[model samples]
Target: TTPSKNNVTKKNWLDDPYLRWSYTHMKEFTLINDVKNNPDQIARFPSALQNLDDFAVQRRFGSATPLKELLDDNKTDAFVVVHNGQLVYERYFNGYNESEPHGMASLAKVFTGAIIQSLAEENRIDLEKTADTYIKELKNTPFGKATLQQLMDMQVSVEYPTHGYEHPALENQDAQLYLASNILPRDKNYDGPMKIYDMLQEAKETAPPGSVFSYNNGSTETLAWIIRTITGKSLAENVSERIWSQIGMEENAYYVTDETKIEQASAGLNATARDMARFGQLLLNNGEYNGKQILPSSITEDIKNVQEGELAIGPGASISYHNQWWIPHNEQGAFEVLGSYGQTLYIDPKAKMVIVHFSSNATPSNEIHSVYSNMYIDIAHHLEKLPQ
Candidate 1:
């Protein structure tokens, strides 16, 4: 029995040329695939000291914040928490549960980043070289000159402002208008299908790449295209081989896709709460899991330490971002994988803890930025206060 009933819409928004070009892609922007056909490749749960009764109590009683406090919010659907690499807390509301797979939104960026890291490790990615060096398709475009490092940091300031909201810049404004018009390529003045390739290919240097910070979903999605084109393996399969397989995840996971089967690299990954909990646990262990080194400590440490400059504008944005992840910049050195609505995978390595909270809130902006911040902070303190 899954937490969420398997009742979701099906569409191939990512693969659709027009849809991908549109700026209306939301959290569940992509359609889903045949889940039962390719169930998550489960990770064995090695034996360790665990208390089922206490875990059950935590589930029944809730976390540091009253279960009701988090659940009471409008869109929060489900959440889970883990401690010392064990399942310590979990909850579901609004018809969600352990088995129900929710869209990961920007959390998929984390996977993309990891893919870049893996390529870097293999020397397939030249961090110092311009992106055009690796991608011949973009040889003539201004984006071709963007460096690999700049792409990773989201510092490439293309004239095409690809912000997810409010289109004020050149490309952004065009995207906003097109998305609103519901016409692909403006049939009359149709440039072309709004696919990832075209958007990236047309980008020009607004500021020198790696000189400015900007958040553009198109850039990130194009990185996905780069990976697919170079790797020859599907993105989903690559994720399993590079990260998921080595991590001590307890369950399998899934990603959202449209009819054309293009998995939205920016926000379509999905998984079970326990499996996500274990993913956080793996990161907390410095990329080591089940006594194996999943990611080099050096890379994992960079992910935790680097700070993402003002998300769409400057250094101190809503939440500090680093390598497509969130960095709290607090004493505890917190970083997370967050989504638009209320999904979170919060990790505090120093506290030896990981918290996986899923939500269904339509707009958790006020509560999440204001009230929920306190909850996580308090929870972090609570985890720290625990007797080591």
Candidate 2:
């Protein structure tokens, strides 16, 4: 059978749904920014690809072994290992490639946190004041009284009840409602306008702002609004300036947005493995990249340490969240950005190491959590003893 040259019927059979979402959801207008005028607006090296054999096996991850030897580690589409600013090992497998920008899901919050802290450092964000002070859009809403600090720590104590798709409520409800209006314009019968600010008008308060640690996308959306208020820039621009550009990222990243082009902030971020590694490296360097301070030094410290004083955790909690990143109380300063279906960015700043893993499976999968727990302990132990 002779293939037709101009058929345009070629199917992207191998394209993962997550990959498609990454591109369409996050990517903004291709040529519409200051960054677009110059490809070098960000940073990239000819190659950070080092021969894995160059480094002798100084030690092995006993019990942890290689990431391959672990159960449920089956679909890790891409894996990149960076140690001390050198690309030690990077691999794309099972139809995954380096050029593709995979979705980081909630990992986006890490980027969002960067923006929020940037504002806090500028005195644009009053950590002790209620978020309502900055976002009149959320005034008298469930999250109105949340302190910037409370939202930062995931201590907002609101009724999010987002426990994955096991419930139709979680499935049917667009996370966008937190950022826009309660009308949920995505529904089949949606009769509402799409404004992130207006969505908050319908949310009901379940707890006081700084009293509990309940997880809520609304809190993150509030931070997004606050960021816009302070920076006078879109979240996409802020992310590019404060993070992607300063870190010298190899490729551009995109944020998911609403109709108004407001970045979702709670989720919907996409990036290549190399760019993700650059972010980790930037954090490892205490927010400096290419000799420029993209984020303030205090925000860098706060990223690693929990918030202090009345500026700390609220009353409720499903997990230990710090500044939109998940922090394990364990040693080695281990923290992660985890998303449904196994999107993970595991970083250990103390060990000068970072590992990013992406995957695709159906909803309600916690296999990554159970499997990576031992992997983290094993890797951290091995990396800690490796020569600097």
lDDT of all predictions, in order shown? 0.58, 0.60
TM-score of 2: 0.77
Residue-level lDDT of model 1, residues 59-156, one tens digit each, is: 21243344455454445555665666655556665545556566555677877877777687778776677767777888856667777667777777
Model 2, stretches more than 4 Å misplaced?
Answer: 1-38, 41-66, 69-74, 160-188, 191-193, 307-319, 384-388
Error of 1 at 223 (Å): 2.3
For each predicted model, how many residue pairs clash, with residues at least 3 apart or on different chains? Answer: 18, 12
After the best TM-score superposition of candidate 1, give how far the Cα of residue 331 lies from its true spot, in angstroms.
2.0
Q: Candidate 2's residue-wise lDDT over 241-307, tens digit each?
A: 6666655566667665665666667766777887788777777777786787876666557656653
